[PDB]
Amino acid sequence: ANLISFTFKKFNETNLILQRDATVSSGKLRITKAAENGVPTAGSLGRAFYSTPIQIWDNTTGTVASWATSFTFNLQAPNAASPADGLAFALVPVGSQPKDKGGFLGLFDSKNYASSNQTVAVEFDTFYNGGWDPTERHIGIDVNSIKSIKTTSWDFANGENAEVLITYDSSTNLLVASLVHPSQKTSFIVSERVDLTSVLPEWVSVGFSATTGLSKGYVETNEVLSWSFASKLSINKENKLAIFNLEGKA
Amino acid sequence: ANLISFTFKKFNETNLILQRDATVSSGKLRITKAAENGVPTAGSLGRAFYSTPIQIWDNTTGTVASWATSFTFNLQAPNAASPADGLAFALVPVGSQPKDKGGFLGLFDSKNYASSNQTVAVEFDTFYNGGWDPTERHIGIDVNSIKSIKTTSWDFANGENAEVLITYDSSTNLLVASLVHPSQKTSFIVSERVDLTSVLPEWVSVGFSATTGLSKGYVETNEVLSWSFASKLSINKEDEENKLAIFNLEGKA
Amino acid sequence: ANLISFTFKKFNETNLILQRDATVSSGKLRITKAAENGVPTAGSLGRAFYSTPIQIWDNTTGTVASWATSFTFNLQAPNAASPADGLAFALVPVGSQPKDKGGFLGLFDSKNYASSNQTVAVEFDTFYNGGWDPTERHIGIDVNSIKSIKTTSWDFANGENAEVLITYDSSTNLLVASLVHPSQKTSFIVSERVDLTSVLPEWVSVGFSATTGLSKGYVETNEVLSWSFASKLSINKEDEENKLAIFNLEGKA
Amino acid sequence: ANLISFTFKKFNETNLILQRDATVSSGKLRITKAAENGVPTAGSLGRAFYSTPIQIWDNTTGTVASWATSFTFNLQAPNAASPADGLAFALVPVGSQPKDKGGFLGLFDSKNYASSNQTVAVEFDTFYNGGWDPTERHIGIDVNSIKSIKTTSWDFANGENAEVLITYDSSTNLLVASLVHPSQKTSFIVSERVDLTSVLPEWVSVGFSATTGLSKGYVETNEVLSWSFASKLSINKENKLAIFNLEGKA
Ligand SMILES: OC[C@H]1O[C@@H](O)[C@H](O)[C@@H](O)[C@H]1O
Ligand SMILES: OC[C@H]1O[C@@H](O)[C@H](O)[C@@H](O)[C@H]1O
Ligand SMILES: OC[C@H]1O[C@@H](O)[C@H](O)[C@@H](O)[C@H]1O
Ligand SMILES: OC[C@H]1O[C@@H](O)[C@H](O)[C@@H](O)[C@H]1O
Ligand SMILES: Nc1ncnc2[nH]cnc12
Ligand SMILES: Nc1ncnc2[nH]cnc12
């Protein structure tokens, strides 16, 4: 039984693949531009992935890996009335590049289900792109498409830490993504049956992608303060979670 | 950091304690004294707990423990229109016997707030009382008493497998409780910040407290398929978060 | 797969089974008695076990558990030329009482093969008994007897920390025991095949046993400063090998 | 504290840095070359390192990591009269390329102390080499030289699995290595203090390195069947060996 595990509490540039604006300053993973004044910049795009690829399904054995991630992220907008665009946890082909700038989160191209990009994402959306987005701020599960397969309402607590837990099991295939805001004592959850064999290639890079506005004044920070991940691929023909969550939060 | 953990996928009496009306047999944890036919009996009080007491907060350093738990439970009633009452993931004192049955869920004596009780539990309510309860079916936390302050909405599933995740964080005192239906997708979550140094004592028996009503018309069951738990007691003024990504994979995944 | 683990970087009473002279003093498991002036006492016997019975083999499936323990102990003798008798990690029946003191270490009655004792022990022996002992300080594997089935040489450093690791890989049926004195850069290792199915019962108590000498001059402390444990019992297949790597970091540091 | 772990009970090319003759064959790491029919080739060298760099020590804080690695290997020589050379678990610089083959195990160049190497290794040596080696088969601790600063005896059994555990306790500076031949009940151990802040860079790649004999007769299989590892680096300011040696090594 193959295992892979890491937990962050402070970040480093060395054990990550950093694309575009993604920078590590003062131990924090800043996926988008943050100037030498403390101001978020619009038009910024960035990607951060773990240096070691992960096997999420095996063809010759037929088994799918069961994984889980947990990260504390902070979105700080000077104007909560004009924010864009958000951040997402993603699984993408090992050396795959970011795509469209802004509301596409540097992950997808269009609203259609296109498995040439082979990208599963869990988005945290703070802007109404409308044609594919629901009314307000939302957590969405993305499958080859920026038009989320399922979405849940999100009371976006600006400038406040957001603690996420995303879990995938092999017997249930239910990709579950939750978010808590301890300062506002709130909690939200998304759950949909996703199958990784059909969508993602055998080996992927896990990590993050975040963007800012296509406008001039649509600015926010998109920081990750900590990150845990663990995966287990069963050999021949459930996983332990409880022990995973504390590993980072606790 | 003092650690304690375990993962049940097949239960045993040898590593479980019983109180009042509990029973452990046949590959699963049937907390209510179930007859051969499958009959829920009213006027009961099931109490299954792990043998080791689990430390919540230290005196010598003054550090709170962060814990996590995951279990797969079912609430089954032959009549859906009359369900009472359900169970609650209890953290009761070791040197304390179960209390009043029914609405009090075998945990408390009175509806009023009293620190003498020393019991925090995550309920999976089914019956409408209202004197200490909200509007309908609810998943909530019980602090020092049976009367809640904030709960969540939850549709009452009948004869459905549900996987539960409950966690506590020392840094923010936040107790987060979730519940997922693999088949129905009906996933719900609740969170609330309550200080446990003021409420709970130092050592508690952790497990499942089950109960029924005072009438045969309102009857239901209490069953657990698999159980997991972890706890972490921080050393010297940490106020940090425990790992959770690796935990849920131990039991559930 | 059923699992059970704990890490005691500091000790407490409520999760242990203390027998005879074993006490928890200021976070330390002081197994044998010490005077209010810091003076070790002769004719002492002490036992401390984990409050949860640990299943090391299943009868209904024929599967054997894989388990691992680590602990740091410290044997502080007023004089090095007169020490006795040592301490041991042992697996014993759930309700087992302390046996003979001294050279028997509270675990055994004789040097002959006593199958009814049902005890596997890893001894850290600081007294040459001759009736069974090798000539110098030694680690031994004890199967239903104080006459060790195998031994190795232990260059014991008086009053210095001993870092111990004991693993049992069920598939190979091999028990391996190692001791490290980090102050002197010394290391020792013992390994021998032991079949748990015919020696030990299904459920066991896991912990410690220690004694001082039977003469007033031959005295020592037998303290355990920290103790971590892990066990993984499979469902139907014989077993899967345990992950030792992440153990110490999460257990011993 | 930051944590990093993995368990390889079955190997893959995707999460390893393969160098020279080392390759994954049927889910096993064959470090030196071996024919389809089983016979190993002479004069070979192989290396395998994990994809993500591991932080052993931190410059500004002074804080040093505690790590533990467990692996099972199999050394099978067609003839016990002519075996060479051996395998080692080593920590090297990030962009480290293989050095001198044969007796130097692909980790060193000369018998003298050279700092430019920045390499800490645990050798398992089956050939009595020249100006460095002790009289019999031996485990060794290699600190910037093929001449081990401390060795212990190792009764090697041809073609029998060897279970290895290596640990580093930061607070005592102690590196401990153990080898067990479970098939014949034998066990071996060595321990020596090593200052890794003097020797190793802040970031190191961990893994293996093995060589076959520089003469045509001196052949052996240099196989690694499983490999588990974990590291723990604190934030400000010991590892549970119980759980590790299992979850990973079982
Ligand atoms: O206000 C900022 C927005 O600008 C829009 O043109 C774009 O569709 C969005 O993705 C967002 O960037
Ligand atoms: O409908 C039965 C009810 O009986 C009441 O006396 C009791 O307080 C309730 O908890 C409920 O069980
Ligand atoms: O001098 C102390 C010794 O006394 C003997 O009677 C006993 O058998 C030894 O184990 C040791 O205790
Ligand atoms: O004959 C085999 C030997 O050949 C030597 O020249 C070499 O130094 C050794 O490493 C060993 O390979
Ligand atoms: N990802 C997840 N978030 C919240 N609760 C869960 N229970 C199981 N998986 C979960
Ligand atoms: N117990 C819990 N269930 C679901 N999501 C969580 N996030 C943090 N704790 C959680």
Ligand SMILES: Nc1ncnc2[nH]cnc12
């Ligand atoms: N207990 C143990 N000590 C040393 N090396 C080992 N290899 C496997 N188990 C071991």
Ligand SMILES: Nc1ncnc2[nH]cnc12
């Ligand atoms: N690597 C190791 N091998 C054997 N015993 C140990 N005790 C601590 N570390 C050890």
Ligand SMILES: [Ca+2]
């Ligand atoms: Ca959007």
Ligand SMILES: [Ca+2]
């Ligand atoms: Ca009620």
Ligand SMILES: [Ca+2]
């Ligand atoms: Ca003796």
Ligand SMILES: [Ca+2]
């Ligand atoms: Ca050599």
Ligand SMILES: [Mn+2]
């Ligand atoms: Mn969206």
Ligand SMILES: [Mn+2]
């Ligand atoms: Mn209620």
Ligand SMILES: [Mn+2]
């Ligand atoms: Mn002896």
Ligand SMILES: [Mn+2]
């Ligand atoms: Mn050598």
